[PDB]
Every structure is written in C-alpha cells, then in structure tokens.
Amino acid sequence: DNSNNPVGGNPIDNYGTEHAPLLKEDNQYLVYQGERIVSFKDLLRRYQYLNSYWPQETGSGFRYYTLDSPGMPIYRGWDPNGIDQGQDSTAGNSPYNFCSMTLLNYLAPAFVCQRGSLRHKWVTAGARVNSTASVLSATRHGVLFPLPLAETAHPLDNALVGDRRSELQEMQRSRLNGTAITPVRLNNTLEIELPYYSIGQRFHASRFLDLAGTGDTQGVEIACEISDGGNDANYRLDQFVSVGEDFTLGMFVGAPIMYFYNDPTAT
Amino acid sequence: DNSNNPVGGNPIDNYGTEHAPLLKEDNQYLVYQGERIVSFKDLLRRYQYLNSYWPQETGSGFRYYTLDSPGMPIYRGWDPNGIDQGQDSTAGNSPYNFCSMTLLNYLAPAFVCQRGSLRHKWVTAGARVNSTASVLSATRHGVLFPLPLAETAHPLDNALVGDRRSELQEMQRSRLNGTAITPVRLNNTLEIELPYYSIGQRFHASRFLDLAGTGDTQGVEIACEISDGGNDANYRLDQFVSVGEDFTLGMFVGAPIMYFYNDPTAT
Amino acid sequence: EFKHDGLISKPASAVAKAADALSMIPYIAPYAKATSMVADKIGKIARIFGY
Amino acid sequence: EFKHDGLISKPASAVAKAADALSMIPYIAPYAKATSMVADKIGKIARIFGY
Amino acid sequence: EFKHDGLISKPASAVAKAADALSMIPYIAPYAKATSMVADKIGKIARIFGY
Amino acid sequence: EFKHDGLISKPASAVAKAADALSMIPYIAPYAKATSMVADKIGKIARIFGY
Amino acid sequence: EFKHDGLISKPASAVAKAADALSMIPYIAPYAKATSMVADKIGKIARIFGY
Amino acid sequence: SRPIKIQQYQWTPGVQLFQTFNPWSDYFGNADVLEKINRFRNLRCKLCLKVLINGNSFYYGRALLSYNPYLRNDQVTVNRSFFIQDLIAASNKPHILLDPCSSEGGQMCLPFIWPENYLDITSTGWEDQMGECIIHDFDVLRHANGGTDPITVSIFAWAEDVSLLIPTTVAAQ
Amino acid sequence: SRPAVLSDIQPYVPRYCGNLANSDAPETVNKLSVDSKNELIDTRTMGLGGADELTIHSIASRMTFWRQFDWPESAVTDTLLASMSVQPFCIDTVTASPVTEIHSTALAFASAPFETWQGSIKFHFKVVCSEYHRGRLRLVYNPLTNNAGPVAFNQVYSTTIDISNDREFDYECKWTDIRAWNACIGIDGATSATFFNTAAAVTGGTPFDNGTLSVYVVNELATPSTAAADVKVQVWVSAGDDFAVAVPGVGLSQLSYFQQQ
Amino acid sequence: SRPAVLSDIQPYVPRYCGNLANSDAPETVNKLSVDSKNELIDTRTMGLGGADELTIHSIASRMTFWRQFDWPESAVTDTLLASMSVQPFCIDTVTASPVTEIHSTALAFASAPFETWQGSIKFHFKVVCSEYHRGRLRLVYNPLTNNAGPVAFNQVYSTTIDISNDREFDYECKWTDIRAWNACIGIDGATSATFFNTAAAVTGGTPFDNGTLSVYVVNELATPSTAAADVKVQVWVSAGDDFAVAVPGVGLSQLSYFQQQ
Amino acid sequence: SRPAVLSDIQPYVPRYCGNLANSDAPETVNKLSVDSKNELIDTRTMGLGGAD
Amino acid sequence: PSANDGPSFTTSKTSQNTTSENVHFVDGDTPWTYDVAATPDETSKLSGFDDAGLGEFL
C-alpha cells in the first residue's frame, strides 16, 4: 500500500487549499527577475574563467611555449597530482590547483556518463614587449593516448635555420590534426571547440577527477611565441571554458562528497 | 463648489480668444528646433559622463586594478561619505564627489519607486605604456549584499605562479556571474548593461542618496591591468552612464531640496 | 521590437505631421514591456514618448 | 538550426506568456541532435530548456 | 530618404538622357524637408539639384 | 556553386540520415567542373565526396 | 551595372560553353557607356570583352 | 475596517497647527487591533484615513495635510521645524486642504506601496517606515469677531482590503 | 574551404565608443544576464496605477504651491499686492549663512535640463478669508512691466474677479511674445533674480520670460467687525496646455542634493 | 576590378572576446574538425532511456534521504522530536579533525549555483516500527519559530497523522512568505548554521528560508511488551512542484571535491 | 551562445576619414541631437517666397 | 474626474454619509478625496490560504 516505495510518496493533507499556486502566476518574471532558468544545459553555455598560464616560466631565449591541456577543465582543490603547491594544515606543502570551480566541474561527477564537444577561449592578457608578432595556435591531440597537463618550450633562436625547423616540427601545429591560428597583435583570441572523437567509445567516466595527471581524449595543445626580455614576465594566457552543443550527461547518481575551504597561501 | 480642491482649478476669463493655440501649429518644429522632446524616458537614453578613475593609485608593481562601483551613478555634491575631499566654507576639509550631475541623478530622488536595468560604458582614455595587452572586464555582484564604492589592487608579479593564480581567484571575473571582457589595445570599450535581479523586490528606494558608502544591488566590478612604470600615471577609465529599456520610476512626490554651488578646490 | 534596421522605419525625432499627438497620454497594458509592446499597440507615433 | 539571425526570432530569455510550460518534460526523438531538432519539434518555447 | 543603399538607385551624377531638365525650377512644397520630399515629389531627376 | 552563405544550406559533415549513400560512386559528366556541377547534378548528398 | 554582388552572377572568366562567341565583334550604341550598357544589350557573354 | 480616532488636535486663533503623525503606526499600534493581529504573520492592508474639522463662518485660515508614501532609505523630504518653503514640496505629495470657514473635506486612501508583498507583523517597527502625514499651517488660525475659542481637527483611520493569512505562534508586535 | 567567396568588398567605419548623443539608435550592448532578451515590465506591479509619469507634461502640469502674500486693511483702490513673472522657474530660497536651500515647483523641476521653453503658464490664486470679507482683486497681464502708480483699465489685459463667488480661481497666461521660444534661466539662475516682489512690480520684457502678472485692488476689503483682519492669498503654479521645452542643456550641471558645508 | 562599389559605409563594432555572459547568442567558433556541422546526438545511445536530466527540476525533484531522529519511550504529549528549516540547502557534515565532509541532497545540489529560490519543499517522513507500535505524530508549520514549550492546536498549521494506516507519508510545505524570492545560503553557508535540531526548535523567519517544520507527539508510543523499543523516523527531502531558482551566483566558488589536507 | 555562426567570411575595407570628394554618397555622421532624424525644412518660413 | 488632475491621481467629492463596519459619519458637507489610483496586480497576494482566517477563528 505504497509503504516501501524507493522514491516515497503518500500525500497527506497540508496547509493549502490551492495546489502549487506559483505555477499559475504567468507574469511573475515580468516583475522580479526578467528571465527564467529552467535547465542546466542552457546555463552551461556561459563561459567562465578557469585558469591562467605564464609562458615566460619554462624556457630561455626566444622560444615557442606549448601547453598540453585537457579539453575538460581541471578541478579546484587539493589534488594529489596538482599543478601548483599550497601550504596545508600541517604547516607543510601539498599539491593544489589554483583554478576556479566551474559549473561543468560541479555538475560532472554527479553523473555517470559524459559525451560532447567542449568550447574554449584563450584571451592573452597582461603586458608584452613592443617587438612581438606572435601567432597563438590551438591544435588537437589524438584520441588514443591522453596526455597530462604539461608545459614545454621549443627554442627558435638557434644559429642554424634547420635546427629551428626541427623545433617547429616537434610541434602538434605541424600535423594534420585540426589547427586554429590567430595573430596576437590583431585578434589575440582563439574561440575553439574540441569535438568528441573516440576509439569506439559511447561515453567516458564523468566521475574522473584526475585530469591534471592523466588528461582526457579531448586534449589540446596551445602554442605561443615568447621572448626572454622583461615586460613579457606579465604576458599570460587566460582560459575560458564552456560546453558545445552536442553535450550531454548520463544518469544522475547523487551529489559527490563536497569540501568547503578557501585557497591557501601558495608555496 | 470646487473650493478646496487639492489640485485647484476654476478657469476665469483670461486674455485669449483661442484656447491653447500652440498645439494647432503642426509644422512648428520644421521651423525652429528640428525635433520635439515630449518624455524624459526618451531623454534618459543619452549617455553622459559621470566620473573618471585612475588605476595607478592603489597598488604597486604590475597588478590588477579592480573597482567596485554601484550600478546607479553616485551623487554630485558634499557627501558625508564622499570619495574625494574638498575645501569647505570654514577653510577646512569635507568629503566631496567630483562627479557630474546626470539626468538620472536629477530625476530619481523626486520619485518614490525605482526599477530597471542600467547601461554603462567604460572608455579607457589617457596615456599608456607601449607594453600593454590588458583586458578590461566588467562583472556583476550578487543582489544580497550591496558593496560600497571601493578600489583594490591584486598583485600579479609574484615569483610563484600559484600565488598569481590565487590573486586571479580573489576576483569576481573568475565567477559564474555575468562577465564581459575586451582587449584595451583593440576595442577599449565595454558597453555593459546591469539587469535588475532582486531578492523578491518589486522596486527600491529611489530617494537613496548614499550610493558611495552603501552601494546598491546592481553593483559591478571593473577590472584592468596596470603597471607601476611612468606614462601609466595618466591611464584612466571614464564612466558613461545611461538607462536600460525596462526602466521605470514610481510616483512623483515633488522635487527635493536643491543646492547651487560650484566645485571647491580639491584637497 | 528587436528587428533589423529599425531606425530607418521610424519618424524618429520630429514633426512627422501626424505626430502632433503629444497631448495624448500613453496607455500601458497590465504586463506590457517596452520593446515588443505599446510602440506597436498605441500607434505609429508612440516612439516620441521613448517606446 | 544554423540560420541567419536566429536570436531575433526567439523569445530567448523570459516570460513569453505562453512559455509557462516549464512543468513539461522535453522529449528527445531516438537519434535527435540538438541543433536541427526538438527546438522545432516540441514547440516554440523549447529554447528555455537550452535547445 | 533614409533607405538602404540609395546611391545604387540614383542616376547620381550625370547625363541620364532624360536628366536634361536642368532648365526646370525646383518647386518646394510649403513645409518640405530635403530628405523624404521633393527628390521623390518632383521627379526621378531631382537629385541633380542636390535633393 | 558561388552562392551567398552556402555552408548554411549543406548537411555539411555528417550522418544526414539519407546521406548513407557512401557506397555510391560519383559520376563526372564529360567536361564537369567541381563548383557549378555534380554537387547539384548527382544529388543533395554529393558534398561528402568533396564537391 | 552598379549592382550588389555582381561578380556572383557572371560567368566571369572562362569557357561558359555558350561563351565561345569570341569571334563576334562588340557593337557600341552611339552614346553607350561601359557600365549600364552593352554588357546587358549585346548578350550574357559580353563580359569577356571587358564590359 | 473599524475606524479608530488616531489623532485629535485643536487650532486656537493666533496659533498654528504644525503636527506630524504616522497613521500606520497609530492604527496598528492600538491595543485592541493588536489582539486581533496577534497570531498572524502577513498583513497587506490599505489604510484609508479621514479628517473632520468643525469650523464656523467667522474663522479663517488654511492648513495642508500631506502624506509621504514610503520613507525607508529616504535621505530627503525633511521632517523639521516650520518653514513656509516646506509647503511647496509638500503640495506635490497626496494632500488635502482643511479650512474652518467652509469646514469641509478630508479623505485620502493611502495605498500599500512597499517593495515586498505581505509585510511581516512579528518584526520590530514593522509599520513605522510606511509613510507618514504632516499638517502644515499656511499662517495662523484667525477669527473675525475676535473670538478665541479653539476648534478641533480629528483624524480617523481604518484599513480597507485586509489580507491577513498565515498563522504563527509568535506574539505580533 | 571548398569555394572562393566572390562577394564585393564592402566599406565600413568602426564605431568603438558607439552613439552616445542620439536617443533612438539601437546599441551593441553586452547585457550581463543569461537571457539576451532579459527585460522586466513597466506597469502597476509596483503597487501603483500604471500611468507613465516620465512625460514632461505629466510632471510639469501638477499644481504646486509656490508663494503667498497678504491683502491688508490699509490697501485701497489701485494698490499692488503682488507681482510675478510669467515663466517656468518658480523657486523659493531659504538662506542660513553656510547653506542656501532651493525649493522648486514641479514646473521648475521639469524644465531645468532644457534651454528653451514656450507655452502657457497657469496660476492658481487662493484667497483665505471668512465669508464676510468682500472686495475685488484685479489681475494685470503686462508683457513688459507695470508703471510705478495706478495701472489704467485700458492699455493692459485685466480680469477684475469678485471674491464673493470665486475665492479660488486659476488664470492661464498664454504666449504673447515676439519670439517663438524664450530662453530658460535654470534653477541656478533663478536664485539671483527677483520673480515675486509684492512691494513693487517685477521687471519682465526680458528674453527669459513671457511678461508679468500682477494683482491690484479694485474695491477695498470689507470687514464684519473692528477686529484686525489678516487676509492672505496663495499663488500656486502649473504648466498650461501649450507648454513645451527644448534644447537639452547645462542647466543642472551645478545643482546638488547635498548642502553647502 | 571593373565597376566601383557604391554601397553605403556601414558602421561596425569589433567583438574580439565575443559574448561570454549570455546563453543564447550564436558564436563564431573555429571547431577543430573536418565537417563544420560536426555534431553528435544526445539520446539513449549511451545505454539509457533518453530523458533530459540536466533540467533543474529533474535533478531537484528526486526524493533523497536527509536525516534521521528517534521517538523515545519517555516521550509524552507535546514533546518535540525534531524541528527542521524549510529551505533547499539540506546537507549533513562529517568532521574528522583535518577534513570536513559535506554530504548534500539533490535538492541542495541543484540549487547551489543560484542566489534566489522560491517554491514548495516536500518532506517525506518514514517511521520504522513494528505493527504494535501506535501513536500520533503532529507536524507544525510555523513561519517564524516555535515557542519553548507546548505549541497550541490553534495559531499554527498542523496535521496530526496517525501512524497505524500511514507509517510513511510526505508533506509539502508551500510558499507562505512576505517576499516572492528568498535568498540562497549555499552549501558553503549551510555548513555553519543549524537546520535540524531535534532538541529545541530551529530559528526560521530569516530571509533565507520559508519557516520551520516540526514534529511533536500527540499520543504516546504504545508497546506490545516490556522490551525497550527504539523507534526512529527518517526525513527524506525533495523539491515540490512550485520550486524555482534564479540569479546565478558565486555559491560554488569555494567548493571542492578534494579533501582539506 | 548555443549555435555556431556558419556565414561566410566577408571581406571589407575600412574607411576612417570617409568620402569627402563626392557629393551624393551617404555618410556615417554622429549628429549631436536627441533625434537621429533631426531636420528642419528649407521653405518660406524665413519670410520669403519659397524659391530655391 | 475634471479640474486639473492627471492620470496618476484623482480628486473627487464623496458622499455626506460614510459607513465602515459599525461607525457612521453624517457629515455636514461633502468632503474632498485624493486617490493615488493604486491598483495592484495578481501575483501580489498568496492564494489558497483562506482556510485559517480571522472570522472563523473559533
């Protein structure tokens, strides 16, 4: 008699004559909000700042900074495999990501499955030297080996022109994969979208938190020229993440265990 | 017999045969003005210069200037909570705003209620150094706590990249709220509009003069990179204010008490 | 409303001889917006009141 | 779908008085995309669900 | 008047064989503007007088 | 052919359910170009072969 | 003539199979311009002579 | 909807009326209505008031009663001592003109105006900042035969369309 | 990447700052909301009736008390009681040595952002007296100014109201000027000039006003006893039906809602 | 290169960074694929049924276990067993000195990115007992707070369920607040406040909740023997039909899925 | 932000100073008035007969 | 109605006899009335809570 229902449900007389009266107020959002938010798939298509990247921290001389990043944003807190290092509760040090908690990072570990394309923007703010004509470029990796989040510099200021060309051929920009380029002095914004290519895969594990140490199959290499002179020390790249149009999440299996804390002192 | 009417009205024979003859001149504005101004809601949609803001006055080094400003323009005169300091009539000092008297600031304390979206432009004039590729960004605050008009600098030139990322995560630009960014070297103008979100509020007090010490629920944070070198001392931000399209004012309860005086000497 | 090149189709500023109805009061329908509303529901010349 | 100036023809954000069907569930046809699909196959107001 | 791409539809400079009415005087209606007026009320070739 | 906004009117990449004629051979007429030709003379889905 | 996107509607360079009238002489009417003239008064293919 | 006499004043010839009262804080500060709005929470009224003046054909002079509607974050519309230049700003607010000669008039409706619907009755000062009335006098009450008797100005008030609907256990202030 | 785009090169001009002078051009504004068409309404959902009150004529047509004068026992035939200037800027000041308060009419409030005005001004006169106070007032309109003595019944426009039947009455001063538009003094400029004199006649005929309206006595005040009677008259002021304003200007760039310190 | 382009100069504004606030504007995005219209589907090709589950109301309407309290032998008439606050943010924490786990309801999961909420909250009560345990519970809704003693049957909203026929039952607390929208505390702010007390009554009446729901005893627990009976009641919680959220905010900027270290 | 704009790349040439030789091309001029279509007439409202 | 009032308000003269819930006013003359013309809309009152009212308190 509806007595061990896994979803419950047995309505007993409560304190209202009219059942659900706020659905009968048609012109409610002409008075208070101006808009109504019904789905998360509509709200996941607002871009949000994830993380910044400084190209004059890897090599020396005039070189070509390359960054292998996952297509899905990395997660916010105390990783065991984090790209930064914070001061923990034992007055020591531990790996930590100083990235933001996006809505995609929030919603994804509560679902089983995940599939879809993912959109990025690379903004290139900061300072720069007056002698730059660099090209910012995004190029996708293969879908067999997920590369972790890594940073590499390719030197371009050799005496041999062939040993410069051999450094430009160590790059994913030289490959048959999809490449988007732009000049930094004229547009400085990529606005790319990573499609969901797969080796016969219908989805992947949406509850996979270790993106900075493993990566996923939608990784992208971001490449930008940098020189070793001053005022390029403040040259950086800002990543804005969002969600493509064929994106979906699987079955909801409950919220994960969450943790609330501010950012520590970066050491 | 119409003898204590609160609005008056008892027409006695005056000196004209023809009643209201200037409404029968159809082609009057083909001769004299070229246009007719009938409503204030049409005239409130002209932008007007409010105030300027100098980012190299808050921090040191290369840093990220952020300014928490109200959505509604602050008022023109001798505040008790003013952002500047002028020489008063007692040959001393008192708080003072050196901002302009906009039409919105003029019309709003004569009405009881106020509701609507408000439009801003941020113009970024002055001088600058040749090594800038900054991004000017506007991002809205929450509607629970109105922040007063304040200025903050976030340092970005630390030795640790994580302690730069922890400063970029102290910013409202990193949040899920609505963000507009632009590059200063390419567009240098935001043209934002603050919507009227509210915690169940139908309007707010249109006769509230203390916007610089309290703020309102339509506040915005404006953010821009700045360096400590010379020729950035003349780098500034100009605010142009205007009125969105769902804007309205309540019931007219009379003009406020006004005051006429020029600007004092700024001390 | 939100239409392509809406300033061309206005009388937009001025005399517009039949726009001497400045002595008329604008009527606002009980949940009328400003955009896709009374500028088309009062008349052609309801754009001098700001709508 | 991929059409020229598609944001003008939406109700796009809001009340849109007949858009108070927020209590309706979206039905997805067995191989339906998001673009040239259910935003035209459910109804006019299927763009508040993100389609 | 204020129309989209109005220079294409003019004869705009020149001979335009029927535009040898240079010996005609332009008539201005009693409250005529220059834009949405006599360039369409005199004839096709009233744009060589500057209207 | 050379038309204005031709990418909007394509199926352009993909499934396009009736575009499972990948087992069909393209026929080239004896002096056929690539542009104003077989992409309209074979069928709608002759743009997955590169035409 | 001065028309919007006139290069799309040309055969513009080439074979255009009926454009093998290269052995025809262009006739110029007694006060014909180059723009709004013989490119429409001779035929479709009078644009290979430069008109 | 039962009227109570919230205010009573007396003009004397030679002396002015400058008075200030809060009709919402006078009606709902009564002892007998506070027993009826006691175990409820939401109120939403509309407080119509009425002014009665008895007068005579020999008295003259005139006073203005004006109503300030909302007054929550209102740093303008001063409430101070008497200036004759406070009658220009107060004549655009909802007002009534009261004289002793015709000895007539006075009834306003005083709408709800408030940014929330259904203001709380439990909370402290829940009716104080919802609009207040001020009686300014233009000069002074006079009399033509030199009579010096005072006359009475009475102000009644009652709530019109009450929506009193959520019960609670908390004592309503 | 298959064909080549053969559309014409189309010329353009970049507009980075936009259009910030005109009031009707659409704008390319990034609204900071989720819905691009985020918009509320402007109606009676604030508790009100639903009338558009940002019309200039809706603000300016409100009858607002302006000033007050008296009509003494010693007044005789052809005695000036008050004289006032026909214009929108009807204010009144309260000085107290550091501060100077300016209390303005809704007619003067709604016409301060502008530089030209035209039209008719409505003056509502309100005599406070008992039933036994009788007499005739007289309302001179003079486009220039009134002379220092009595004003003749010819050569001016006058009305001569009896205050037995009409103790309260309004008088609409129409447009009788040599221009079409007069200038606006502003609330900033009206605080230094005399616009209500009640001892002599004010100076009109300027390019800023529409003349002057004055009140004289025709018949003396009749009294029911030997008591001293202090009769006053109130001047309320509003916009007439003709009233228009133009040329948005710098009339309120020096005004403030904070006292002088 | 034959004619001259006589189209008008058309003004433009460059948008380099794009539109990253609105959720409906089309984008000029270089997709890194071969086909420009590269797109998968979002259906039952993952092994599932085909329902759209990124709706806010589809996530928030799931009945999820929240907490559990007990109903002792020593409980008598008008004894409070539990009191809880009517709001979305129903979480529960596990502290262990460096780490502090936050376990959140799907109702609290689906309402954390927002700053305003409204609507009805559904509470499912589930009494675990044998067939011989009898009594009456009582469910007080109070918009403000309950007093420290017995609560009267008048002056509150109550139901008084018999647990013989209905051992499991849900109760929908509708919207009875003075606003239209309350504020959202967030999962970050709900970890410091008391929302389930079971020893006293919780404090409602804040701008963050819709009151309080409390459970009292009307009739005592009847027992079949002299054995000690430990009867418990489970509180499950879901969103009602009215439930809506708005104002996307900063509610999850401080949350994380990695423990505190 | 839902779909992707698949219109063609359209070439353009910027004209900052405008067209200051021809007498018939329309102009992108910011008129410093409230009404964009602010325009007087050219007639006998100057006291004259109305001839061009 | 007439006499110098706008769309936002109304000045009228009501009756000499005023009844409101056990208090009668027999006035010597018709008073003046200033209405601020405030009609609220729907979605400004809670609907469905007419069960526990003041009249049926007992």
- Is chain A touching chain I, with at least 3 CB–CB pairs below 8 Å? yes
Q: H144 and I225 in contact (C-beta within 8 Å)? A: yes
Q: Which of residues 162-221 of A touch B (CB under 8 A)?
A: 184, 186-189
Which phi and psi (to 5°) does residue H24 adopt? Answer: -70, -35
Q: How far is it, in rounded angstroms, from Cα A177 to Cα A192?
A: 13
- Name H50's bridge partners: H107, H156
Residue whose token pair is 């056929």: F32
Q: Which of B184, E7, C8, J14 is nearest to I13 (CA)?
A: J14
Q: How far is it, in rounded angstroms, from Cα B207 to Cα H73?
A: 7
Contact B35 K34 (CB under 8 A): yes
Q: How far is it, in rounded angstroms, from Cα G33 to Cα G26?
A: 13
- Residue ranges of the alpha helices (H) in G1-51? none
Please report, for chain L, how many H helices and E strands are present, in that order: 0, 4
> Is the CB of residue L42 less than 8 Å away from at least one CB of chain A?
yes
Residues of K in contact with J23 (CB under 8 A): 1-2
> Is the CB of residue B233 less than 8 Å away from at least one CB of chain I?
no
- Count of Cβ atoms closer than 10 Å to residue I194 Cβ: 12
Q: How far is it, in rounded angstroms, from Cα B162 to Cα A99?
A: 9
Contact A52 B165 (CB under 8 A): yes
* Buried-state track L9-24, b at ≥16 Cβ within 10 A, e below 16: bbbbbeeeebebeeee
In I, what residues contact F, Cβ < 8 A? 2-4, 6-7
Cα atoms in the Cβ-side hemisphere of radius 13 Å centred on I140: 31
Residues of L in contact with J158 (CB under 8 A): none
Solved how? cryo-EM
For chains I and L, count residue pairs whose Cβ atoms are closer than 8 Å.
40
Q: Token pair of J59, please?
A: 């996530």
Residues of I in contact with F1 (CB under 8 A): 3
Q: B247 and B44 in contact (C-beta within 8 Å)? A: yes
- Is chain D touching chain F, with at least 3 CB–CB pairs below 8 Å? yes
* Buried-state track I28-57, b at ≥16 Cβ within 10 A, e below 16: ebbbbbbbbbbbbbbbbbbbbbbbbbbbbb
Q: Which of H112, H108, H19 is nearest to H69 (CA)?
A: H112
For residue A33, what is the nearest residue in chain I, using CA coordinates? Answer: I40
Q: B160 and B84 in contact (C-beta within 8 Å)? A: no
Give residues preceding each break in chain H, C–N over 2.5 A: none
Spatial neighbors of H64 by CB under 8 A, at least 6 apart, are: H87, H90, H91, H95, H96, H97, H98, H135, H136, H137, H138, I65
Q: How far is it, in rounded angstroms, from Cα A102 to Cα A59?
A: 30
Burial class of E3 by CB neighbour count within 10 A (0 to 12, 13 to 18, 19+):
exposed
- Name A146's bridge partners: none
Q: How far is it, in rounded angstroms, from Cα I18 to Cα B242?
A: 13
Q: I163 and I135 in contact (C-beta within 8 Å)? A: yes
> Is the CB of residue A201 less than 8 Å away from at least one CB of chain J?
no
The alpha-carbon gap from K9 to the nearest alpha carbon of chain F, in Å, equals 9
Q: Token pair of J236, please?
A: 């499950």
Spatial neighbors of B115 by CB under 8 A, at least 6 apart, are: B196, B202, B203, B204, B246, B247, B248, I40, I42, I46
The alpha-carbon gap from C28 to the nearest alpha carbon of chain E, in Å, equals 30
> Is the CB of residue L7 less than 8 Å away from at least one CB of chain B?
no
- Residue ranges of the alpha helices (H) in chain H? 23-27
Q: How many domains does chain J have?
A: 1
Q: Token pair of A246, please?
A: 């064929």
- Is chain G touching chain L, with at least 3 CB–CB pairs below 8 Å? no
- Is chain L touching chain I, with at least 3 CB–CB pairs below 8 Å? yes
DSSP code string of chain I: --S---PPPEEEEE-SS---S-SSS----EESSSSTT-----SSTTSS--B---BHHHHHTS-EEEEEEEE-SS--TT-EEEEEE-SS--EEEEEETTEEEEEE-HHHHTTTTEEEEES-EEEEEEEE--TT-EEEEEEEEESS---SS---SSSSB----BTTT-SEEEEEE----SSS-EEP--HHHHTSS-SB-SSS-----STTSS-EEEEEEEEEEE-SSSS---EEEEEEEEE-TT-EEEEE-STTTTEESS---
- Name H98's bridge partners: H63
Q: What is the dihedral of CA H64, H70, H74, H78, to 10 degrees?
A: 10
Q: Token pair of J195, please?
A: 């929302």
For chains D and J, count residue pairs whose Cβ atoms are closer than 8 Å.
47
Residues of J in contact with K4 (CB under 8 A): 26-29, 31, 36
The alpha-carbon gap from C8 to the nearest alpha carbon of chain A, in Å, equals 29
Helix/strand/coil for H26:
helix
* Buried-state track B50-67, b at ≥16 Cβ within 10 A, e below 16: bbebbbbebbeebbbbbb
Q: How far is it, in rounded angstroms, from Cα A177 to Cα J34?
A: 9
Q: Which of residues 21-40 of B touch K (CB under 8 A)?
A: 27, 30-32, 34-35, 37
Radius of gyration of chain F (CA): 11
Q: B123 and B237 in contact (C-beta within 8 Å)? A: yes
Contact A15 J100 (CB under 8 A): no
Which residue range forms the structural domain that includes residue I222?
1-261
Residue whose token pair is 């060589």: E48
Residues of I in contact with B10 (CB under 8 A): 166, 168-170
Q: How far is CA D31 from CA A200, A204, D38, G34, K31, in A?
A: 18, 19, 11, 57, 55
Q: What is the 3-state secondary structure (H, E, C) of D2-43?
A: CCCCCCCCCCCCCCCHHHCCCCCCCECCCCCCCCCCCCCCCC
Q: Which of residues 17-36 of C touch D (CB under 8 A)?
A: 31
Q: Which of L34, L32, L31 is nearest to L16 (CA)?
A: L31
User: Which of B30, B31, B32 is most worth mutating to test chain E (most E CB atoms within 10 A of its CB)?
Assistant: B30
Residues of K in contact with F7 (CB under 8 A): 6-8
Question: Starting at the edge strand that comes first in sequence, how are the strands of the sheet with I64-71 ordered?
Answer: I64-71, I231-239, I121-128, I168-173
- Name J30's bridge partners: A192
Cα atoms in the Cβ-side hemisphere of radius 13 Å centred on D41: 15
Q: Which of residues 92-151 of B touch A (CB under 8 A)?
A: 117, 130-135
Q: Which of H42, H58, H47 is nearest to H21 (CA)?
A: H47
Q: Which of A141, A137, A178, A140 is nearest to A154 (CA)?
A: A137
Helix/strand/coil for A67:
strand
Residues of C in contact with A30 (CB under 8 A): 31, 33
Q: B149 and B68 in contact (C-beta within 8 Å)? A: yes
User: Which of L51, L54, L58 is most worth mutating to test chain H (most H CB atoms within 10 A of its CB)?
Assistant: L54
Contact I41 A46 (CB under 8 A): no
> Is the CB of residue B266 less than 8 Å away from at least one CB of chain A?
no
Taking CB atoms within 8 Å and a gap of at least 24, the contacts of K42-45 are K42/E28, K42/E32, K42/E33, K42/E34, K43/B30, K43/E28, K43/E29, K43/E30, K43/E31, K43/E32, K44/E30, K45/B30, K45/B31, K45/E31
> Is the CB of residue F9 less than 8 Å away from at least one CB of chain I?
no
